[PDB]
Amino acid sequence: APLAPPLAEDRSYRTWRVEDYVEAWERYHGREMTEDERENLARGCIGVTVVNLNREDLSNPPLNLSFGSLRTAEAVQAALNKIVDTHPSPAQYEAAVAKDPILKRLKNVVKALPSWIDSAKLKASIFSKRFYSWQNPDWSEERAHTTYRPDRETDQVDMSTYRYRARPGYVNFDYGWFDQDTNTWWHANHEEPRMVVYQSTLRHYSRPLQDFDEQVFTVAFAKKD
Ligand SMILES: [Cl-]
């Protein structure tokens, strides 16, 4: 039973009072949201994703495994879920990753595993991040506009230069949590107060905006309930 129903056929998004989202969240995860979790949620869009990763070792969603297209992220998700479904130790995970036709060509796959969480408690999850390319005002325009181009072979986007810099006069980022039960994207407007949670179609979440000129689809390990 999904956290929320799907969107109507003629709807691009549904808006949620934070209080109503939390109740739906608590029904779905079958437990009360903690104070640390509520505090993370109050950070806005980034909080929706941090709370859903369910990982106390994270304050920000990890960008290690970021890709130019949703389909690549979905393939990487399936590959990773297949490996952690065998309950590997960290060393067994590294070996498995090395043999996997998709994962072995990627950067940061080994780093993506949280060693202190047993692999039987993990699942690969997806979120989409929108951001501004000009992360250093000193960069030339050519550098800004090529730094986050996806690898022509693996579709992987190098995020190591990313500094959470906003386009001057705009919001720094958006994060959208991929709800694969209903095929919607969960985000928010900004941090508390007056935070509103959004449940959007991918097209609406991805729509042209002055704030952002880059979008990636990112795979990260979440901790199961
Ligand atoms: Cl739409």
Author numbering: 2 to 226
Reproduce the article's own wording on this structure.
Transglutaminases catalyze the formation of a stable isopeptide bond between an acyl group (e.g. a glutamine side chain) and an alkyl amine (e.g. a lysine side chain). In contrast to mammalian transglutaminases, bacterial enzymes do not require cofactors, such as Ca2+ or GTP, and function over a broad range of pH, buffers, and temperatures. The K. albida gene product is significantly smaller than MTG, amounting to a calculated molecular mass of 30.1 kDa and a molecular mass of 26.4 kDa in the active form.
